[PDB]
Coordinates of C-alpha atoms in Angstrom, one line a residue:
Chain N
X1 CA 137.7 46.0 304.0
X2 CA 137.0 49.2 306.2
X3 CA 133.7 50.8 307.4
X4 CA 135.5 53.8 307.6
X5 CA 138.3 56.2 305.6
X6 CA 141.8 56.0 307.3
X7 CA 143.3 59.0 307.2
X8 CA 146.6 59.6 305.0
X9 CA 149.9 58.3 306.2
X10 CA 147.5 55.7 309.2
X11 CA 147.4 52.0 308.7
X12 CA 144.5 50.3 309.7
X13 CA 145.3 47.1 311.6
X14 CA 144.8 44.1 314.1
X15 CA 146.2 42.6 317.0
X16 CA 145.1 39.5 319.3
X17 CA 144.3 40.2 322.7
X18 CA 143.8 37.5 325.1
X19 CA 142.1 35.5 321.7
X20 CA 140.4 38.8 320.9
X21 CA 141.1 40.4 317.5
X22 CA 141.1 44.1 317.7
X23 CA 140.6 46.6 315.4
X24 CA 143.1 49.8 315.8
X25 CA 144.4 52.4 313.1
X26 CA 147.6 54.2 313.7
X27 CA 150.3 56.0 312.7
X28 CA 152.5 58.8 313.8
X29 CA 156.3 59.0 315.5
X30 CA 157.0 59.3 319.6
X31 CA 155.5 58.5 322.7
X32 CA 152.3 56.2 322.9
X33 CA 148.7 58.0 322.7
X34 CA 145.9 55.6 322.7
X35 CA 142.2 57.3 321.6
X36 CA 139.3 55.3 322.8
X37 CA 136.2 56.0 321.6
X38 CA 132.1 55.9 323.0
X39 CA 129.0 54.4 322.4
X40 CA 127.0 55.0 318.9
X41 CA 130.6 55.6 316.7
X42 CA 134.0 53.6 316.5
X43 CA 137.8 54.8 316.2
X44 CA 136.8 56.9 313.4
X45 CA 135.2 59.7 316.0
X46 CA 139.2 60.6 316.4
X47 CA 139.8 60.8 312.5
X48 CA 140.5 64.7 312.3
X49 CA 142.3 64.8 315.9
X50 CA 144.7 61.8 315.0
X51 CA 146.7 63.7 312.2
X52 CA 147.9 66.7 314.4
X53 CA 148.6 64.4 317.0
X54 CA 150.6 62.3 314.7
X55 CA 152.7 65.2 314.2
X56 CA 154.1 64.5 317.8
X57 CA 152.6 61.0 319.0
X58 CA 152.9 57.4 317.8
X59 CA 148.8 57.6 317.8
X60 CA 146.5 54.0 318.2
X61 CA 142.7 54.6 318.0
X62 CA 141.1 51.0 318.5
X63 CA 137.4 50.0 318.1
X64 CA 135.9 49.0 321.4
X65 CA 135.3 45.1 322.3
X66 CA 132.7 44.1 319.8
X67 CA 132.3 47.4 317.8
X68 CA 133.8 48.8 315.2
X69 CA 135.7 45.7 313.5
X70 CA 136.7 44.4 316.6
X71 CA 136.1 40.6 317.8
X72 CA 133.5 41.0 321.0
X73 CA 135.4 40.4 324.4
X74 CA 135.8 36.5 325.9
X75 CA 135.4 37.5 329.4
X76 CA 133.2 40.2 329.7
X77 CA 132.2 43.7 329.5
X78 CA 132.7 44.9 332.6
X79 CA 135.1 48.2 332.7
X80 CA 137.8 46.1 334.4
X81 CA 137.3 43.3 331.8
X82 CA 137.4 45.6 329.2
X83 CA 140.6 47.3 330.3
X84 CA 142.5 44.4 330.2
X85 CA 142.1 44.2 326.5
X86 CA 142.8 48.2 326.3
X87 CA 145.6 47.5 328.9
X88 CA 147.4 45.2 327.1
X89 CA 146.9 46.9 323.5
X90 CA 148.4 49.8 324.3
X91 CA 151.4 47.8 326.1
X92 CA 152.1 45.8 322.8
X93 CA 153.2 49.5 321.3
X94 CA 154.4 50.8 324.4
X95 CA 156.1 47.9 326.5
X96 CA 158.9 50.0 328.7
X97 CA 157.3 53.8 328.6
X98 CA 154.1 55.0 329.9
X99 CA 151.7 55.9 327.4
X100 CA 148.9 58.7 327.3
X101 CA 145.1 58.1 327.4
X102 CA 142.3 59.7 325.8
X103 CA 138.5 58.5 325.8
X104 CA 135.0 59.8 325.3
X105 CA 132.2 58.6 326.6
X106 CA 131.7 54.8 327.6
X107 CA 135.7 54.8 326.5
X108 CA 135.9 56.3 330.1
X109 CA 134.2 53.2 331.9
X110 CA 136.3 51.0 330.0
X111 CA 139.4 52.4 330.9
X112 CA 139.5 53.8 334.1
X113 CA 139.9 50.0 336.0
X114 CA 143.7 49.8 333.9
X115 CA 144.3 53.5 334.6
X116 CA 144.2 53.1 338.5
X117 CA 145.6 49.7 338.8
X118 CA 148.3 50.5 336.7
X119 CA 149.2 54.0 337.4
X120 CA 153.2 54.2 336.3
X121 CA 152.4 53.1 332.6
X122 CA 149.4 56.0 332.2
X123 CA 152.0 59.2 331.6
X124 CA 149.1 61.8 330.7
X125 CA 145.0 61.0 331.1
X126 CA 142.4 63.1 329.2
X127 CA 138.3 61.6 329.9
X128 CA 135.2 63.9 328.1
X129 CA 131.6 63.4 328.4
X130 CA 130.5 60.3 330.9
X131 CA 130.8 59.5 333.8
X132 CA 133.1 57.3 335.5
X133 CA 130.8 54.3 336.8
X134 CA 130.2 55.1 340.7
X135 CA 127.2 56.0 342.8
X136 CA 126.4 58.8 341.0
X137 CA 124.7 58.0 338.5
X138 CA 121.6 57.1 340.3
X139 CA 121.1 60.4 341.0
X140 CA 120.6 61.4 337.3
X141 CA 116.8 62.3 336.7
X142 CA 114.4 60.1 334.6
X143 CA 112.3 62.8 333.2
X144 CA 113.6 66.6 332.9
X145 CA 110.9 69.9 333.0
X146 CA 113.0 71.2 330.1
X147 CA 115.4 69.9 327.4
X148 CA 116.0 66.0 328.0
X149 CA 117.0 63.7 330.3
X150 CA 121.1 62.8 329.8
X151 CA 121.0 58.8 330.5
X152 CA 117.2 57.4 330.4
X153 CA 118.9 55.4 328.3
X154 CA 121.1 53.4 330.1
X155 CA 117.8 52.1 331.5
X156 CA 116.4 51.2 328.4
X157 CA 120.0 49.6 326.9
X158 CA 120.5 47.4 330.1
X159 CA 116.8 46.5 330.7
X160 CA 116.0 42.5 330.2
X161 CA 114.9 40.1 327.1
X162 CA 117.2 41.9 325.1
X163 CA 114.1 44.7 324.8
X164 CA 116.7 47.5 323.5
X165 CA 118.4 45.1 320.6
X166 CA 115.1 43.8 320.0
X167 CA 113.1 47.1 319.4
X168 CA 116.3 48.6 317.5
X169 CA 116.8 45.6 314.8
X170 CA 116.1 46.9 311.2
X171 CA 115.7 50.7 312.7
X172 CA 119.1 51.2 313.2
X173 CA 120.3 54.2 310.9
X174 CA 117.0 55.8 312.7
X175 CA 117.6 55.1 315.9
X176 CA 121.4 56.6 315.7
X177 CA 120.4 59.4 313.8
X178 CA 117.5 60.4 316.9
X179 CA 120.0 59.5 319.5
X180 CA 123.4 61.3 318.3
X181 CA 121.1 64.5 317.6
X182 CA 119.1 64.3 320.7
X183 CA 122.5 64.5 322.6
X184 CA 123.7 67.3 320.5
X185 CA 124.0 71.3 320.3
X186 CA 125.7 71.6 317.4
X187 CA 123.5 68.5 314.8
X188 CA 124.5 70.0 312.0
X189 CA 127.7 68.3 311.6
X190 CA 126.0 64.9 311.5
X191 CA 125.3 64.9 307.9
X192 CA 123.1 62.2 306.5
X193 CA 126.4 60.9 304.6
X194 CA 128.4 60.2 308.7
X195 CA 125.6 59.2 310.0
X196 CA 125.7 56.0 307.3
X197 CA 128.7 55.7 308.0
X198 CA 128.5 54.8 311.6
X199 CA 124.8 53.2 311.2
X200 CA 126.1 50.5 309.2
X201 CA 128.9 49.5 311.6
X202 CA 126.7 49.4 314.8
X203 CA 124.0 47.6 312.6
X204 CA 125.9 44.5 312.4
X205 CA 124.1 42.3 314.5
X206 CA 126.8 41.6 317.2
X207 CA 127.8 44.8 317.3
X208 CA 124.6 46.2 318.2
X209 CA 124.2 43.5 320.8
X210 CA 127.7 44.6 322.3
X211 CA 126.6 48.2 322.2
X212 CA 124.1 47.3 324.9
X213 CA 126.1 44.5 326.5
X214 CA 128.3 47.5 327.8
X215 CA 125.0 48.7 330.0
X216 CA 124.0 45.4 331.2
X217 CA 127.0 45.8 332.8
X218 CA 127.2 49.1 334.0
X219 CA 126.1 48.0 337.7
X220 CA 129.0 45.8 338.3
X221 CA 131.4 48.6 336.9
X222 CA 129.9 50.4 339.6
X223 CA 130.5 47.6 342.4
X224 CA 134.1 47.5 340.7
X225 CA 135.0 50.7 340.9
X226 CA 133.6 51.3 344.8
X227 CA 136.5 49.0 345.7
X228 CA 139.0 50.8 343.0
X229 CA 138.4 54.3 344.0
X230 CA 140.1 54.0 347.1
X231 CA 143.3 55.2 345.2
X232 CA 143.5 58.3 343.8
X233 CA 144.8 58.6 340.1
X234 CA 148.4 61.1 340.6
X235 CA 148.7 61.7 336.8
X236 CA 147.9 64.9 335.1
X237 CA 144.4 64.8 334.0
X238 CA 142.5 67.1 332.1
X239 CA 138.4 66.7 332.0
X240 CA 136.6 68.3 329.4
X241 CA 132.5 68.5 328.9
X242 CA 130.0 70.2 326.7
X243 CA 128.0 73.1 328.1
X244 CA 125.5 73.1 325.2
X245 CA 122.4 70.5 325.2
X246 CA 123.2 66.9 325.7
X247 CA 126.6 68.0 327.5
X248 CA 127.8 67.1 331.1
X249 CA 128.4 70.5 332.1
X250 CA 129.9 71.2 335.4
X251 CA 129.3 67.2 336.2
X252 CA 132.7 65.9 334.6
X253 CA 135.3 68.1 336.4
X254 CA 133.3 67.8 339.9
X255 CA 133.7 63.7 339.7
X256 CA 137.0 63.9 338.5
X257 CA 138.1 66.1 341.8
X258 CA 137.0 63.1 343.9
X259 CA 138.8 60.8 341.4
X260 CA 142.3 62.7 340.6
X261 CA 144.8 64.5 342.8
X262 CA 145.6 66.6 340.0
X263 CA 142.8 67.7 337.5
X264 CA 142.0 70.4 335.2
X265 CA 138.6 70.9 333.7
X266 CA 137.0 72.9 330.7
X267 CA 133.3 73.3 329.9
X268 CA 133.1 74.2 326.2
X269 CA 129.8 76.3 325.3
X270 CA 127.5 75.4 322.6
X271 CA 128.7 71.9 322.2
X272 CA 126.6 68.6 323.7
X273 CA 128.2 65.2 324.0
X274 CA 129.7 64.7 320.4
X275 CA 133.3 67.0 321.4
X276 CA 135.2 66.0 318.6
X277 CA 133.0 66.5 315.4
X278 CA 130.5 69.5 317.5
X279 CA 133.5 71.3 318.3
X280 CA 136.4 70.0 316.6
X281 CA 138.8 73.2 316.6
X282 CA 138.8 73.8 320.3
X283 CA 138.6 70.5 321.4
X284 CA 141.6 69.4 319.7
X285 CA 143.5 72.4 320.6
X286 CA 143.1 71.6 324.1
X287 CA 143.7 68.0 323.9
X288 CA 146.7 68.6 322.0
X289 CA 148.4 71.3 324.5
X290 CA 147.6 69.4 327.5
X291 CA 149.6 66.6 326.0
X292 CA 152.3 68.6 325.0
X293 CA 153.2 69.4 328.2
X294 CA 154.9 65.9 328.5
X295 CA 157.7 64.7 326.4
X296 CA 156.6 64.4 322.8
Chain O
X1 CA 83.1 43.3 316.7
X2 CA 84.3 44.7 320.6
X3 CA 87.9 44.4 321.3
X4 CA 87.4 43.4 324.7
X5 CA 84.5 40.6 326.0
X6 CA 81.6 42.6 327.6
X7 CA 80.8 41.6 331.3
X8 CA 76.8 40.4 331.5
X9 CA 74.6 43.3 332.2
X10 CA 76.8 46.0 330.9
X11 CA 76.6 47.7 327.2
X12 CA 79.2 49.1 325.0
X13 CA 78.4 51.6 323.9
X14 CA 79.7 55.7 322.0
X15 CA 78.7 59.1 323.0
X16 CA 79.7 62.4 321.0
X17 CA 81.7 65.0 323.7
X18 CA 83.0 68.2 321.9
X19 CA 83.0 66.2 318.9
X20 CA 85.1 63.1 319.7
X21 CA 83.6 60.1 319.9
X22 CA 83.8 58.5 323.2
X23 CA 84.2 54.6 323.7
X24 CA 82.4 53.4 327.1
X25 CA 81.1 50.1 329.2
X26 CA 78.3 50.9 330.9
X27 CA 75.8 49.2 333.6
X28 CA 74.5 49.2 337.0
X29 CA 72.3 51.6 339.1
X30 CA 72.1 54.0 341.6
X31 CA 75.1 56.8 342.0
X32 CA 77.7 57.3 339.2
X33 CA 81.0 55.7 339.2
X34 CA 83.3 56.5 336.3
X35 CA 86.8 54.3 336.2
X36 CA 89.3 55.2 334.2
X37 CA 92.0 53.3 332.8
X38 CA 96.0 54.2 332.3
X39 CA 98.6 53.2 329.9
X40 CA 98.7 49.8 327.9
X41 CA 95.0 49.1 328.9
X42 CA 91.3 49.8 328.4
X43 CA 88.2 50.1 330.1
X44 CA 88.7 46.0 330.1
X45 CA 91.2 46.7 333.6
X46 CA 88.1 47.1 335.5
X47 CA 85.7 44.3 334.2
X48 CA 86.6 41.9 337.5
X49 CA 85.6 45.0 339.4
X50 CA 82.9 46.3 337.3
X51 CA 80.3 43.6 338.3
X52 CA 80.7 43.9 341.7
X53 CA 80.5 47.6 341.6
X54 CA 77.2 47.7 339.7
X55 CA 75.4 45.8 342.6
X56 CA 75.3 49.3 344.1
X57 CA 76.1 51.9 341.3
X58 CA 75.9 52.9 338.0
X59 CA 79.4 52.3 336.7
X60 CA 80.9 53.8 333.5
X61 CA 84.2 52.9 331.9
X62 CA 85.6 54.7 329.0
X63 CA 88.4 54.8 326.9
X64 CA 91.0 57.9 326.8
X65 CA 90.7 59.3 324.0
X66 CA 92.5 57.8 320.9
X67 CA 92.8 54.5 323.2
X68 CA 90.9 51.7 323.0
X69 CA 87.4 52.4 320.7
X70 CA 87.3 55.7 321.9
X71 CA 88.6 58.6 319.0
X72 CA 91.6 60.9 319.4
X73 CA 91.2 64.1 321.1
X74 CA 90.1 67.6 318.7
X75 CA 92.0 69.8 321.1
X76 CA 95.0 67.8 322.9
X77 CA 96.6 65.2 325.0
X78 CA 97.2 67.7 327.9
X79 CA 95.8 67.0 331.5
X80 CA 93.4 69.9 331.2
X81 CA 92.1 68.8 327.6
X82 CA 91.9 65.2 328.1
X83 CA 89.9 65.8 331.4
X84 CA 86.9 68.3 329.4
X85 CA 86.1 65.0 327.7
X86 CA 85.7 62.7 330.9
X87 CA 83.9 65.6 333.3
X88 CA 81.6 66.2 330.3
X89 CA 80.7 63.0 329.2
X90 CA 80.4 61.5 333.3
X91 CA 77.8 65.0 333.7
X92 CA 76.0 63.4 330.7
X93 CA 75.0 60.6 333.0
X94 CA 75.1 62.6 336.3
X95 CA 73.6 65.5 335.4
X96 CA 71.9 65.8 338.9
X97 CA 74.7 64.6 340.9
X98 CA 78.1 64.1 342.0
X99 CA 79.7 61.4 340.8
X100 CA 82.7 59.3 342.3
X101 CA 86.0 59.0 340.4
X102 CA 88.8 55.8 340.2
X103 CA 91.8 56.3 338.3
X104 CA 94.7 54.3 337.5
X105 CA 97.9 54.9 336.3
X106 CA 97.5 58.2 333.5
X107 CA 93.6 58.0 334.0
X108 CA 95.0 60.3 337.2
X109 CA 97.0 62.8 334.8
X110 CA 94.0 62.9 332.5
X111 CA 91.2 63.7 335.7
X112 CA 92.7 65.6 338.2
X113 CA 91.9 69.2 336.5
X114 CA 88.4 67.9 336.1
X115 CA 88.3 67.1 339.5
X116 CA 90.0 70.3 341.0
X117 CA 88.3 72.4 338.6
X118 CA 84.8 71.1 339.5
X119 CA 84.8 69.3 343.5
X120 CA 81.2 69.9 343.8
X121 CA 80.9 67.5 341.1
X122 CA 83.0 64.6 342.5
X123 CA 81.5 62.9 345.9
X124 CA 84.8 60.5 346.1
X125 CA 87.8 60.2 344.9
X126 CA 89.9 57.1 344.5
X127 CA 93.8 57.6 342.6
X128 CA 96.4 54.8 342.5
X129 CA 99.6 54.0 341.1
X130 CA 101.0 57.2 339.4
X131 CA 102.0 60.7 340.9
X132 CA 99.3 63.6 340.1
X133 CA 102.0 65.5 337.4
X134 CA 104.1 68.1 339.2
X135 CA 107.6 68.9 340.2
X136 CA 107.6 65.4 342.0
X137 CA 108.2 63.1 338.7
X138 CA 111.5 65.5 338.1
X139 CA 113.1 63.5 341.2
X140 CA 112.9 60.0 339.9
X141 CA 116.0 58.0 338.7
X142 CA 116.8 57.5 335.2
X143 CA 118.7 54.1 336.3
X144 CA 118.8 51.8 339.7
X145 CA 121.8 50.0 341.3
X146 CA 119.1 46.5 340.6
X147 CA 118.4 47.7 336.8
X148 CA 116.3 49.6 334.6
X149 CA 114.3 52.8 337.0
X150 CA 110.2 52.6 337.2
X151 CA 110.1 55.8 335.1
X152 CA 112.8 55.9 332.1
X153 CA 109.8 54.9 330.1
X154 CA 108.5 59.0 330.1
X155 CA 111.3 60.4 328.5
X156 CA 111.3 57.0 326.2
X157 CA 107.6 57.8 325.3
X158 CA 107.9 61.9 325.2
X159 CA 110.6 61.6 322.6
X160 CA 109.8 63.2 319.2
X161 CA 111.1 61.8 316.1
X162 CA 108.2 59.0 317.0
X163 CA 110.8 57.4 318.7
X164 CA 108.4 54.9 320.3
X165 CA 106.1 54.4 317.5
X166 CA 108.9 53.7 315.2
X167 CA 111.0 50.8 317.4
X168 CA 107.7 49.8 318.5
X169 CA 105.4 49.0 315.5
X170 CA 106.3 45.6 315.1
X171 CA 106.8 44.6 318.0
X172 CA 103.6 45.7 320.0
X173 CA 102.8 42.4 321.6
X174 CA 106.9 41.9 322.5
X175 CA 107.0 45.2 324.1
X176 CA 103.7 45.2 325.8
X177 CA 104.4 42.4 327.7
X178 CA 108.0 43.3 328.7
X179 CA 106.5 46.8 330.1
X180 CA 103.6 45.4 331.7
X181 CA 105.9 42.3 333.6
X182 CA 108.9 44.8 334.3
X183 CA 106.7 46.9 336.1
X184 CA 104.9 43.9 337.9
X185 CA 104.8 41.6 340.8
X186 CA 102.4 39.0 340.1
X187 CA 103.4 38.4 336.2
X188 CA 101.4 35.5 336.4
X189 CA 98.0 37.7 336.2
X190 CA 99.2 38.2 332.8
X191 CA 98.1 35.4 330.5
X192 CA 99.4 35.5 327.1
X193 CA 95.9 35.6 325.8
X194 CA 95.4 38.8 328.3
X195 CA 98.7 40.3 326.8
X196 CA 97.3 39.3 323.2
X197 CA 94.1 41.8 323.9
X198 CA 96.0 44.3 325.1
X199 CA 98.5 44.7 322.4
X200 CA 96.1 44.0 319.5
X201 CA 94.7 47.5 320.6
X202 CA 96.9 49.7 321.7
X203 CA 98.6 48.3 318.3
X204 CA 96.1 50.8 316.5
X205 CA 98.8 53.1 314.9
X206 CA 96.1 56.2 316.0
X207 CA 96.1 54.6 319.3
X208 CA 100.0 53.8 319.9
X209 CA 100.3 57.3 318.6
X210 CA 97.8 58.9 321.1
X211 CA 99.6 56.4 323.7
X212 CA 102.8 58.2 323.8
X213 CA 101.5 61.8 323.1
X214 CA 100.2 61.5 326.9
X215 CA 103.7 61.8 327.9
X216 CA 104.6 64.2 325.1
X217 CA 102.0 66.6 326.9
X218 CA 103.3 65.4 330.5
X219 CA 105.7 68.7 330.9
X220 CA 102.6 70.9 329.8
X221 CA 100.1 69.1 332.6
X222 CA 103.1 69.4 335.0
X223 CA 103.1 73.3 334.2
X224 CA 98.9 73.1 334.4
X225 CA 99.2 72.0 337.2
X226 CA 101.0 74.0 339.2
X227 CA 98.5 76.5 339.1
X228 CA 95.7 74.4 339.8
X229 CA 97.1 73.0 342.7
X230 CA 96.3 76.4 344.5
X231 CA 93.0 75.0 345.3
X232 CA 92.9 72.4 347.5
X233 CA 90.6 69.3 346.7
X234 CA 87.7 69.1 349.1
X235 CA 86.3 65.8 349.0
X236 CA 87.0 62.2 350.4
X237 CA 89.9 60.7 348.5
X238 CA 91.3 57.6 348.8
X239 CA 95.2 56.5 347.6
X240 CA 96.0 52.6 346.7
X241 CA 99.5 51.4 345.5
X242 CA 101.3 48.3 345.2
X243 CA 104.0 47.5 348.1
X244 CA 106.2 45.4 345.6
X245 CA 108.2 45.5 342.4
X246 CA 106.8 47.7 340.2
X247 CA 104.6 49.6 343.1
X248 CA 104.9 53.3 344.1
X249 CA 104.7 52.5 347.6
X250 CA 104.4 55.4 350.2
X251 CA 104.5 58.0 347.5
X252 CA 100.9 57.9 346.3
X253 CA 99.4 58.8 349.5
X254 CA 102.5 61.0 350.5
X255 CA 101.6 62.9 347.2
X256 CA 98.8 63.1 348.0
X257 CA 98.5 64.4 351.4
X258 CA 99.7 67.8 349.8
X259 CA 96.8 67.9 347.4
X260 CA 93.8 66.6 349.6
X261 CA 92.3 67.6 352.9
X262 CA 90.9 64.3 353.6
X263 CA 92.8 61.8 352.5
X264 CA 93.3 58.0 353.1
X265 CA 95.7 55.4 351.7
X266 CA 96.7 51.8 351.8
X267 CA 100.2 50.0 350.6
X268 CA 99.6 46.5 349.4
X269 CA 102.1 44.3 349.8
X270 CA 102.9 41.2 347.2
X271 CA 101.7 44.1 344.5
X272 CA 102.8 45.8 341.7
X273 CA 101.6 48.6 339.3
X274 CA 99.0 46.5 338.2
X275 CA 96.4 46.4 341.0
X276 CA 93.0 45.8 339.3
X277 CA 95.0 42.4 338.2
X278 CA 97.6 41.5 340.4
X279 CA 95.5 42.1 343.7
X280 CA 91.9 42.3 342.2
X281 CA 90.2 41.1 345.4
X282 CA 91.6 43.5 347.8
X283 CA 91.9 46.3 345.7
X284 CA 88.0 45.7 344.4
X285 CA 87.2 45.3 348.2
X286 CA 89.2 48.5 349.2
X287 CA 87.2 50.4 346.8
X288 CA 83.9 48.9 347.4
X289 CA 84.1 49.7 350.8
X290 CA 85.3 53.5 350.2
X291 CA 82.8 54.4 347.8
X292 CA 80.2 52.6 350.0
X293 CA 80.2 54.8 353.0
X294 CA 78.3 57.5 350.5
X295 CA 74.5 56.6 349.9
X296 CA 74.2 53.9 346.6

């Protein structure tokens, strides 16, 4: 059984973690990549990247903690709980080489904790499209004078009585289709057909629960990372961000800086948060050179 | 049938203004007072203070249009638009004389053109618990190191799609109260038959509708505004917020100080957004006393 279409020559799999059973799809030849995906989609946001990558990389795309098909986490959803799991994935597949790391999106809070306190076994680190969880992100607006505001929503997904999970039930495939669009430029590639897709995977009942679960904890990922950040990540790291409505814009790159020693950025125009399907050819072409650049 | 219980010695009661029909409590003599209520209430927020009031004035409380009993606007939900309707229907019973003007919550979005527009009309003004609409509202967070901000909720309600309408029918009463007590510090006031009222008519799909399409005109009073606020308003005005969770604190009269020549405020501690309810006896005596220095 799988929610989504694994693409030719990729085995869709599990593995225990710490008595957590997660979801992954791979396939390719070489040195490690792991692709972790964001909020609102699963492992199948990497579907048309993973081939060309497989061409040089042993690729792993896993569903998050609780999404996806995978098992929700035993501790918690912290980013440093969460990158445990992540952590010790990847390690399974890549036990005496250091491995590279691509995510989008919440992927980013999840694994930036096993990033810096494991810096020799991260060869290569790519992040697009969130923030990494520090002080910053109380300074993001509420209300905007034009277009939207980016993250009013982790206010509504982390607010109390379950009020997110409780308004969403049965409105699921609505709410998705609203909030992928709303943080688009390019909507046109969420068909009605994709959109079903990944509606009926967050719709399961714990999954949509752990969808939120991730914001409830977003505060003590902050007070994580305050005490993380004192180190400096020394890996190559490439940031990239839509310029288009719903992207980050400048934002990504100018956090990294205080984050990385050694950090390239790229703002790519006309596309919003959804990189991969909005702007699929030059996205991957980026992610695939900067990872060429290592062994592969 | 009346959705809310009628104090003794007051009428409900309709009157036609530019063709909407216009929901009202009415009693009292002497001077006109007209209160006017905000978002997830009704006239029924002033009935403690209402009684009181009408031992020296004529007091009027209406319903927004498209709240309440009171129809939808013909024109729109705008600050300028709504505020024709309340100037014109308060000179149907003041023809003769200035009137005085509370407002709570966005009962101050929907007067203050009416008020600029028309000082010699207004003999005092009270305003508490929301900001006037201008550049100010573009500065609050979407997201707090304690939890959800005080306004994610207006990019929540301007979204289109009928974003609220559709998670919320349903689930009126659930959501109600979660928005009322997360912007509260005396939850207590709240009674679950209180709540029961509330959400049975803002429930109204016309009326949850004309709820939200406030805040979808928010950006358009902001721009309104800015050109109104040229002119300096004139008369006596007081400011009241609430000092605890859920209260604006300093920034009502702060606000308001750039607006108002003579201007008074008052922080009250152990309160939330909620004044008429959580603090009823000081707030009723604070305005009492303000309005009572003028002849009644």
């Amino acid at each position: 059984a799988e929610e989504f279409p694994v693409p030719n020559g990729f085995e869709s799999a599990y593995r225990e973690v710490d008595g957590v059973k997660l979801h992954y799809v791979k396939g390719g030849q070489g040195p490690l990549v792991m692709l972790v995906h964001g909020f609102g989609q699963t492992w199948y946001e990497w579907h048309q990247l993973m081939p060309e990558l497989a061409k040089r990389f042993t690729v792993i795309a896993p569903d998050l903690p609780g999404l996806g098909q995978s098992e929700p986490p035993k501790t918690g959803y912290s980013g440093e709980q969460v990158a445990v799991y992540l952590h010790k994935l990847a390690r399974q597949f890549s036990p005496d080489r250091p491995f590279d790391l691509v995510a989008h999106d919440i992927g980013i809070w999840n694994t930036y904790p096993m990033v810096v306190k494991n810096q020799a076994d991260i060869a290569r680190l790519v992040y697009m499209q969130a923030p990494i969880p520090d002080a910053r992100i109380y300074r993001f607006p509420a209300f905007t004078a034009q277009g939207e505001s980016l993250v009013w929503h982790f206010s509504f997904f982390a607010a109390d009585d379950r009020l997110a999970e409780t308004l969403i039930a049965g409105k699921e495939r609505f709410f998705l289709e609203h909030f992928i669009k709303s943080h688009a430029s390019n909507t046109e590639v969420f068909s009605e057909r994709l959109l079903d897709l990944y509606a009926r995977s967050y719709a399961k009942p714990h999954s949509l629960n752990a969808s939120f679960e991730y914001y409830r904890a977003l505060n003590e990922s902050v007070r994580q990372n305050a005490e993380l950040a004192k180190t400096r990540l020394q890996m190559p790291t490439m940031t990239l961000a839509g310029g288009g409505h719903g992207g980050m814009g400048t934002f990504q790159l100018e956090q990294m800086k205080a984050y990385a020693e050694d950090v390239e950025g790229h703002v790519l125009p006309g596309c919003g948060h959804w990189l991969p399907e909005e702007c699929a050819a030059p996205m991957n072409r980026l992610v695939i050179d900067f990872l060429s650049r290592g062994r592969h």
